[model samples]
Target chain A: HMRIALMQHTARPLDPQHNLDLIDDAAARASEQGAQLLLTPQLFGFGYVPSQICAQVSAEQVDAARSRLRGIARDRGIALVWSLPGPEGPEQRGITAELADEHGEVLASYQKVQLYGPEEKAAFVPGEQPPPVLSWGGRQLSLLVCYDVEFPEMVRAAAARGAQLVLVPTALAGDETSVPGILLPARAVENGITLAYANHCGPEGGLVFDGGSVVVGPAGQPLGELGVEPGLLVVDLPADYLQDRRAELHRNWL
Target chain B: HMRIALMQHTARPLDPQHNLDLIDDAAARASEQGAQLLLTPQLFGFGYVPSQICAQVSAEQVDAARSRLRGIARDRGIALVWSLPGPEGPEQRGITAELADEHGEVLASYQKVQLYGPEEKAAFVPGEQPPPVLSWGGRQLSLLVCYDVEFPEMVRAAAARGAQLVLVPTALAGDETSVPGILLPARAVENGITLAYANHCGPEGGLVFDGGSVVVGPAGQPLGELGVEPGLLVVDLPADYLQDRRAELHRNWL
Candidate 1:
């Protein structure tokens, strides 16, 4: 079983250094709580404010901040997953996220394909390709940003690539109509993979993010959850959970 | 918007005449509700019993019983859709579902791809391809019997053929987790098509068919659902509802 911790951050708008400090504190707390890994909201360094500031902030700024985060991960001896808006490859400049190991090595990177409203389109270019699965602990894990989780094909592709666990970094409000509520569970059952949704708590910029963060099992059962409070929700995920759940829902697509 | 009624059946084991009576009642109710067309369950004449008797139940018996339904539909001035085991095809020797109009004219034919669980697989042969779309109520409607709804590919194929609405003749039990709650919405959302699911109410053949029948909008929202009631559910689907509340995640696939 992998002990995972999800941090619900009350992020600030376009504050890289301030956000890094907050992330450092959160990572320390998670490590104290016996968490092997910690995941945060999308664009955690700069925060998911309006995309207009993408012109103001350079890709070099995000790279520098990520280097700092890598140092923190190496010092803490814990894996970290964070998001940023930077140039990917040569043609793409989008709101992308990455997962790093305890040794501060880049494990995997997932580019965001579906950017919601006009704000994202102006601030960041959308990712064109899907991400592949990376081995984490004893399971194959993949990362998806907000809005990417809403589509079946994207996640189905992840499951098709033999992903047993999917990490979702999101900045969405909590309504009964929220996609994470229905889509996350459906994705879990449909693909038979554990889905962990890490959402931002409190407000960022002017938009209020309804922080109903949760970890879901392979069978779409809610495993661990963090309510409106900004805290760390730790969960122990067993490898057998996926094996048992996949029997009912066919993994034939793989 | 089209007023269409999907007439699902309980389909008891080896009860042909009784199945006919049940379908007749459903057709009458649909016509009374001012529905322009009716979609009956698979093997509406003789239930999916899967005994040696199922192999013997020929097209003649089903045609004779459907002739009676035709007389009823012509008298009521309502179009009808039903399934029966037809004559032996080239590849396989078994029955297929026969769809007939109000004037007793055969509109389309569909066979069960996945015959229920083990009992069904033993009793019936798998259909080679999915059913084609039938023109009715100035719209193209496709039919997918019980187990066919479980697979997303079948629904996608139907939608790709430009099917506007899908009538699913299902025999759902409450015990199955994925059927009504999970799979129905997933199918509708994935295809971006209106889905109407109907089933038999009350227990039949010792196995309970929990009547949680529902009609889901293209956005995967429930339309006029009564939970587990015995009476017929009636609702008008808005034409523009689907194009509006769309995910747009994988519009190309739909």
Candidate 2:
């Protein structure tokens, strides 16, 4: 079984330094509990306000922030996953999620392909292609950011490419209405993959974030879940979880 | 808004006569309650007993059964949906779902594309194409039988083709572990479509059916739901429900 820790916290909007501090504290807590991976909410280090994020922080600052997070991961002896604004190329900008090994080495990164609304679309360009899956702790892990996981096609594509665990960093608006209660679990069970969703809690710049972060097993069972408050959830995912469920349902053929 | 009535019942295995009688009573109840369309469980007429059905009933008998159901639909002035064994051209056999208008004319027919288990795959040939969307009461409707709806791709295809409502006839087992609680509502919300899932309740031979039939709206809200007992769910599907939700979520682009 693999242990995962999901970080659900209220982001101090427009305060990158404070948010990183939050991640630092959360990483220590998760590492102390012997979690292999610690996942944070979407754009958690920069705060989820996308419009102001680019204006406030420079490219140099973004690189510096990543470097600091990498050191934190290495020091804590735990893998880390978090999202931030990424400049893909000269013409495109993306909201990207990154995964780092416990040794502080970058493993994989995925840009948000399914931007939520007009604001997100206007702010950042979607990813050109689906992210590559990474081998971590003898399991296949893939990344999705916020609204990307809401679409079944996104997750299905990952599962089709042999992803066992789908980690998402979401900035959901409402509290346990659709995504957490219905969509996330369905995505997990239908694809026969373990899914960890880390979401922001409380208010951020006039928007109230829905916490309700969760870790769902292959059977669509909630292994660990957090309510509408800032907290952490750690859960164990069995080795044969996906394989056992696929045998039972023949979901792959379906 | 359109009113849909879903019939959830225990099938009398291999008994076409008794099953037709059950449909007759259910149709009357739905019609009296002012439902525009009545949805029945998969292979309702043949009691969902796949192995015994082809041997017990002849081609002539299947045609006769459909003709009888057409007459019932015309007499009751209500649209109907149900599934049965279908022979495609010369040699291939398929498990098919069909929709009929109040005039007893067939609107659309879809062969089950995602056959459930090895037993089903051995008995019937899967569909070559996705089901067509039909215009009913100014709303776009589509059909899927049994395990077909379990796949997200099937529903996504229908939704992409402008289906506003999806009618599913499922023979789910093992209680409310995954299908009803997670998958059905997820399909509804993700596609921004109204979905009605009619299921077989109680026992069918050795298989204990999980009833828990449900009607879900575009926002993933349960319009109406039935417990394990055999019953019917008649609920109003608002005209602007899908439109309103699409605007709210901007799911079209995603």
Candidate 3:
């Protein structure tokens, strides 16, 4: 069995240092709870405000910030999954996320391939590569950010590429309906993969973040879920959960 | 807006006559409730029990049964979607379904593309064509049977081919979990299509049907749902629902 933890909380908009401090605190708590990995909300390191992200953050600053996060993962002895802004060129920027092992080594990195809404379209370049999947903790792992995970094809691609678990960091806008309550579990069970969705709570600038973080098992069952309040959620997946379910999944295609 | 109704009930196993009588009664009730289209569970005309379906019913019997169903659609002035066992060649049989217009003319037909279990694999042949989509009620319409709609890619394909509403006839076995509750809504919203899933209630031979049938809006909201009891669910789809959602759908692929 493996233990996973999610940090569902808002970042101080545009403040990278305080966000990293929050991650450090969450990682410490998660590790105490026997979690092997800790996930943070999307772009928590840089905050979720679009205008601030587009104008204030720099690739160089993100590089320095990621190094600090890696050190925290090492210090806490827990693997970390987090998102940040990545600049590919002077004009092109990609909303990217990565997974770092407990030893502070990068395990996998992926860019948001599916940019959502006008804010994202204006602020970041969409990725072209398929989401990356790699072996971690004796299982296949992949990373996706926010809107990217909402598209079924993205999760399907990850599953087809042999992902047993997928981590998502999101900055959702509202809680008027149950996107987390509905879509997350469906994606997990549909693809026969364990999924962790870490989302921001409270508000950022003019936007209200609907803080509903969740961890879903391969059977589309909720392992653990968080409400509008920000906190840590630790959940366990049995060692044979995915293998047993995949053998029975009625998975098909067009 | 279009009103769709589902017949969430069981067919008399191996008795086509009694099953047709049940459909006749349900169509009358749905029409009285102002439903324009009525969807029945997969293989409802021949029962969902695979062994009996493979051994007892012939394509000749299915042909006669379909003609009677078309008459019911004409008499009731309600478009109907139903399924039966169809023989494509001497040795190959398939669980196929179709849509009949209010005028009782055949609208579209689709065979089960994803066989669910060992019995299904032995009893039927899987379809090869991408589900066919056509114009109806000023919107694009298509058909999928049971396990076909469970696959995100099948629905994705229908949505990509311009389907605005997809009608499904299913025979699901369990309600221990909310696969129908979660996955159905997710599929509808993810594809920007209104979905009507009609499933069997009660037991068929040794199998107990879960009986949670539902109709979901383009926004992944439930129009109406039926529990374990046999019943008819009528739901309305606003004319602009699909168009509004498709415009907002992330709809990205890797």
Candidate 4:
């Protein structure tokens, strides 16, 4: 069995210090509760407002936020997965993911391939390559940013690369109907992989984000979910449960 | 507004003549209710059993069953839609469909596009093309057999070809869970077309068939349903009701 922690972030406006404290406390509590790895939502730093900070925030500011999460992981002695907006190079600008080891070492970093809506495309650049599986704690783990998880190709590509667990960090607003309820289970069934979905709660950019974040078992059923309230969703994922379930129910019906 | 009737079917084991009589009564009721069109279940004449009898039933016998429905349509002043165990053609074993106009003309004829299980392939030939849309009471309606409705492409193609309504004749068995609740709604939403699903009731060939028939508005919500009970399910489908509901409920979403 793999012990995983999913953090549903209740992000506040521009206040990085307050958000940092919340994340630190969440990471500490998750590690204390027997989680070996902790996953956070996309663009957790400076919130999801890209147009407001596109001209205001610098590359150095984004780097500082990444360093803060890396330090927390090293201090707590637990693996960390942090999703943040990144300007990878002069050509690439998108919601990027960083997977850190217990020692705060950046093990694997991936940029999101898919961008939802006009705002996302305007704010970020799409990823060039497919995702690769990260090996940690004798488990094959893969990471995807919010919009990337909606595409079946991304999950299938990850599974093709020997990924057993898919971690999605999402900036969820409005209805959570499509995510954990429909797409996540479809991903789990098609790829035979466990999905741990974490979302950003509360409002952002004058829009109220309904916290319907959830974790799905194999074959698209909800194992756990966060209601309307802002909080953390915790659950343990079994290693071979997905593979067994897929074999039983999801035969080639097509 | 178009007035359509969804007819629940009761099969007569090995007797095609008896089954035709049941269909004739249904057509009369639909005409009396001011319904211009009547829809029946798939392979209603031969029953849902795809077995030794399926291979044994010839095209000549299927033609006879189709002739009776055509005659009933002319007599009752109602369009009739039904299915039969057709002779095996090049594509598959023999399963065929017939849609007749009020004037007793065979407006459109189609074979089952999909050969469901292993035994089905041994009995019926697959359809080369989808059924064409026929004008009935100022509305173009598309006809689809069971298993054919499962594919999104076939239904969407009908809509693209200017079909306002989709009439499905199904021999769908198993539980209420197996009865295409989401599948029907999803197809209607995706294609923006109205759907009328009529299924068979009672046990046939030792396999029980649940006859929960549903008439969905264009917006993909259930207007009314025929329960699992063995009886006539007469519901008047107003044309503007479906179009109005689609515009109101899913105008923004689309």
**Which lDDT value does model 4 have at A196?**
84
User: What local lDDT score does residue A126 receive in model 2, on the 0 to 100 scale?
Assistant: 71
Assign candidate 3 its CAPRI class: acceptable
lDDT of 3 by residue, B1-254 (tens): 78888999877888889999999999999999999989999889878888777777777887889999999999999999999877453149788888899999998888777777778878888777678899987799999887777777678778877898998999888664455777888888777788888889888767788888888887787778888889998887781222322222223322
Error of 3 at B31 (Å): 3.2
Q: In model 4, what lDDT does residue B47 have?
A: 71
lDDT of 4 by residue, B1-254 (tens): 67778778668666788778888888888888888888889878767767745645665776677677778999999888887765443234457677888898988877666556666766665665655687877888888787666554456556756787888898777774423554576566545678888888888767777888888776567777887776666666661212212222111211
Of candidate 4 chain A, the 10-residue stretch with the lowest lDDT total is: A245-254
Clashing pairs in 2: none
Indicate the residue-level lDDT of B21 in model 1: 77
Chain B TM-score (each prediction, in order) = 0.81, 0.90, 0.91, 0.87
Compose the digit string of candidate 2's lDDT tens values, residues A175-249.
647788888889988888888999998998678998889998888888889988889898877812222222222
Q: Tell me the spans in candidate 2 whose CA falls farther than 4 Å from its real position.
A: A87-91, A239-254, B88-91, B239-254
Off by over 4 Å in 1: A87-91, A174-176, A238-254, B1-9, B51-54, B65-72, B86-108, B111-135, B138-140, B160-164, B190-192, B202-206, B226-230, B238-254
RMSD of 1: 4.9
Task: Give lDDT per model, in order.
Answer: 0.70, 0.80, 0.81, 0.71
For each candidate, what's the DockQ?
Answer: 0.20, 0.33, 0.35, 0.09
**Runs off by more than 4 Å, candidate 3:** A239-254, B87-90, B239-254
* Per-residue C-alpha lDDT of model 4 across residues A163-235, encoded as one tens digit per residue: 8888888887777464555456656754566888888877776667767777777545667788777677778
Which clashing pairs does model 3 show? none
Model 1 lDDT tens row, B1-254: 56767654466666777777776787788888887676665554665445533556665665577577777677666676666665553224344555566676767777766565555655566766655787776777887777666655566557766787787766666566566677778777766787877766556655567666678887778885645545556677781212321224333222
1 or 3: which has the higher TM-score? Answer: 3
